Symmetry: none
Subunit: 202 residues, 4 copies
Amino acid sequence: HHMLENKLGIINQLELNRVEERVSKENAKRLYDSGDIDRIEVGTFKGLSYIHNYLFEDIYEFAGKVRSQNISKGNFRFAPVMYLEIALEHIDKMPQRNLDEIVAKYVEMNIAHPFREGNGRATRIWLDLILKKELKRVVDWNLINKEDYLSAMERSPVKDLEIKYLISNALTDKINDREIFMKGIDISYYYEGYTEYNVDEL
Amino acid sequence: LENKLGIINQLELNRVEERVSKENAKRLYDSGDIDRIEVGTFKGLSYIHNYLFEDIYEFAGKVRSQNISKGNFRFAPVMYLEIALEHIDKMPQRNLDEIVAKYVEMNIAHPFREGNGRATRIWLDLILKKELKRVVDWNLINKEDYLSAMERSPVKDLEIKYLISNALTDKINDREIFMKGIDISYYYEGYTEYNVDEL
Amino acid sequence: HHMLENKLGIINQLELNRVEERVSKENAKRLYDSGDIDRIEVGTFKGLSYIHNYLFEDIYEFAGKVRSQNISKGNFRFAPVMYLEIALEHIDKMPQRNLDEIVAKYVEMNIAHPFREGNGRATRIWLDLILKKELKRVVDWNLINKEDYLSAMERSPVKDLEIKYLISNALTDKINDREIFMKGIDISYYYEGYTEYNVDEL
Amino acid sequence: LENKLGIINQLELNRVEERVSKENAKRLYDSGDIDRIEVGTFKGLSYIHNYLFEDIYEFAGKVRSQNISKGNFRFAPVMYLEIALEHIDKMPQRNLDEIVAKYVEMNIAHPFREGNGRATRIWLDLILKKELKRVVDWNLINKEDYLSAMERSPVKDLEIKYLISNALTDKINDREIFMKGIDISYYYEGYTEYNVDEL
């Protein structure tokens, strides 16, 4: 599902990590600077899919499309492909009127993990848009320490108090501030282990 | 938990639930209704569960609408609980292995808001009796061994198969085994006040 | 380590559960009504040991003494016997000046799990005494739902935010109120799966 | 993390740490100091760690005083970290099995406040070279396979033994293998900005 491996024959793990950061962070910058970020359906798998394909169209095969394989990160098991579609339809109709609802919906979408890869980054953009539209806030992701966030996300299916704490104490009303967006892209990628570039410099 | 008896204190609700529900278990068996239930489907499990809990909970026999977990495990998300139940229904149950795998799947499903383990072990005995003419002498299974095997069961089900296999008896119409099974099964879940056959 | 099994030949699991609740809850009532509860060293393994033996002297072999076997509840692994003594000495010198310190010390003592059995109940009495002495508060344990508490305790070694939330929102300044104590004994035992008796009726 | 360079932003600290520490790794190897370290003790590991991190952290080479965890696993509690280190020191290291068991134990220990996985993989290569005249061609081990095996290692260490065994090479004095190992080992931990041999 790595198009660069398939076509370009770049097979080394670190270098493919870096090329994926390069290309997809450039796409993310384009997403914001075009205003495309704010012209897409909010809180729906259609919106998540638009985002995923915007970032990864050249990078992951079938970007923006539901995966066809079961995936899991360690002990954390994501929705079986079997049930993905129905579950996503079920996520579409979840409400998003306050922070509690929005957090619960973000958590269900994380469990769903609809893509083979790129779920974290794309779903964090999805989430920030939901918060913008519904609460007129976004997350200042630089305030949320990487390890705290990853632990909170892994705990969120049993109890979402941790992720709720982090998210609520990192909300700002700087909803269209370019630095918040660009910094959050750098932080979001750093969560996943890409640290080479600043999105601003692409 | 919202209950139709207006209980607020969690321990009083625990004891009220034990009293009411174990009495309905005794009735389920003595009336013979237990022998008139579809075996191995969520339809039968729902019947069992409503039978035990209708008096005390409005959510009895119904697929839950909230997500629930126990410790570090989240049961089948509401996103796909129902479709998962539809697929557990089609699971074969021809030998002890397939039956225990089906039981482990239904336990991961945990379809009700409350009362899952107890209703589901009654369910499992129904499957075992229909297909192997055995049931589980639950008194032979220590609570810690059973809870440990169940926690391990989503990743390896071999221990829960061991325990169940070694507690099976062909005394499938023995009332003492059933009532003692009810008390032990409630004891797994932390209900110890009552002896069912004394209700 | 079940003396009733060893001497009385009561071997059935449910009945031994019930007899242990009967005898040890009666001891717990004695603990409070004698005032013995408030004449013991606070926040030390010596105090925890006094409590454990007060409750379980007739019930568990070598009550109040450190275990000689490795134990674990499921995926949760407690300090190896190997390291128990040193660890307990290390727990003795932990500070207890605010709720954060007290919670962290309670968590380390839960990981330690110094006894073969009876750790939860005895350590909750230990904890309530620390809170009484240092903050002039105790926990109203009936406000803390069993499943919330057990999840929080299992999560406490990675992140103690959950158990801290529960404990802090269930503090009361009714530090010598008999109903708080007796109810908390009933609730504490119910956490562990003993529900037959009210301690007040013994 | 309090660092002596006054960094506040977590990602800038990540990059500063990569730059400084990988440079000290290059120096550790090029100077030959890496061949003058006690092999298989916390003394040697502490030396490695201070060598990498003294410039950036005050806690370099020191046994941590805070507890730390990663996701759902808590590393060896401060209650008994030191005594646990004393016992890991006495672990034999005569074959690949005993060495990997020792490495898994030291990883559970996670003795430093930060920098454990990287310093400890350098440590492990030292043990492997001294005892088997092999090292790990880390480029042959995919990050996901390695992290997965390490998460599983406290309960079953057979997968981490598999991966390590199948990545071993007798090229124990090959600088390209070492520098590439440094980059891959930092990449496991989420540091990808720099190539060490270009520092």
